[PDB]
């Protein structure tokens, strides 16, 4: 029913740089989207929900915005702990839930 | 008489939350920043009757609003306030930056820290007691691992929206 | 609260798989929460299996050919996943999670994303 598309597939940056990631949906969704982070060989964790709401206990350098069909995740200043894989997931009420393809960040 | 609760001037600190004993005016308003109910629907509240209705109020930091929910975790949930896993009621909150915000900081509102055991649902610990420490008696602070068990907020007229104060009230129903 | 999982590490190339997840310091009997199962193939993205709600209702992933099954066990307060007639493509890690349900000011019913995750379990198809 509903589908996504993430880009870029792979991204390269360095400590202190700016990073942006875009999650696009096939049909309009009323801000029901979230972002997860996964370290190698560990369970994921939640960072953003409702496309704009920050999670409790996560640093303030993460931010997100958008609605309808375009969403963006932004990191103000990369730290050595921010190199991981990120996924976008939607939990609309009219269609099955699905995950994104994922994007990877590494040191330049 | 909800006006006495939603329009009072003095509020309590989170570690010493205040309890009271007892709807269209509430859910039709748009000033409230957060409005969530568990176990019941706000629109159906007029069609039920209960024997007990409790109201609890206090003030916390904006970033800590998510901690007021069943099954959450954090300093506030672990040592200051705790909701059962089968709670039934509503949570109301709104911004209060125009009040409780003095130039230079308030340092009036406090929150507990360094407690040794997690709280049980619906209980409060208010007395400032001997300082948390290790295996050595402590009557001061010199004890490199000794710490005073309370801390104060630093509300100021200018701060990030996440650090501004928020007034929160919790309603509970039981029959 | 903590979640623990129990399962077999090896399975024959045509057999029945059985997993179990549990909680400590709480209880499953509550109309405030919901559960789900996630899996991840080696070196690939995540996949969502389905959801189970209080009162026994369930909701599955249409892409999968309804091969899986989710159910409670009130005698033990467990939740389990069932998959008979496994094949080569069933090797992956499996996770159990939990969420929250609430009502909006307007009266509608909303949901929150997962916020508790298990440690995962690894399964291999032998031969």
Structure description:
- The complex is a heterotrimer of chains A (108), B (175) and C (127).
- Chain A has a single domain, classed as Immunoglobulins (Immunoglobulin-like), CATH 2.60.40.10.
- With 108 residues, chain A is an all-beta fold.
- Chain A has strands at residues 4-7, 10-13, 19-29, 33-38, 45-49, 53-54, 62-75, 85-90, 98-99, 103-107.
- Chain A is globular, with a radius of gyration of 13 Å.
- Chain B has 175 residues and is mostly beta strands.
- Chain B has a single domain (3-174), classed as Alpha-Beta Plaits.
- Chain B is built from 3 helices and 7 strands, in the order αβαββαββββ.
- Chain B has helices at 3-6, 24-27, 75-79, and strands spanning 18-21, 34-38, 52-61, 89-95, 110-112, 150-152, 165-174.
- In chain B, strands 1-3-7-4-2 form a 5-stranded antiparallel beta sheet, with no helix packed on it.
- The longest helix of chain B is centred in the middle third of the chain and has 5 residues, at 75-79.
- The radius of gyration of chain B is 18 Å and the shape is globular.
- Chain C is an all-beta fold and 127 residues long.
- Chain C has one domain (2-125): Sandwich (Immunoglobulin-like), CATH 2.60.40.
- Chain C has strands at residues 2-6, 10-11, 16-24, 33-40, 46-53, 58-60, 69-73, 78-84, 92-103, 109-111, 116-117, 121-125.
- In chain C, a hairpin with a 5-residue loop joins strand 9 (92-103) and strand 10.
- Chain C is globular.
- The N and C termini of chain C lie far apart (38 Å).
- The chains are: A mainly beta (108), B mainly beta (175), C mainly beta (127).
- Chains in contact: A-B, A-C, B-C.
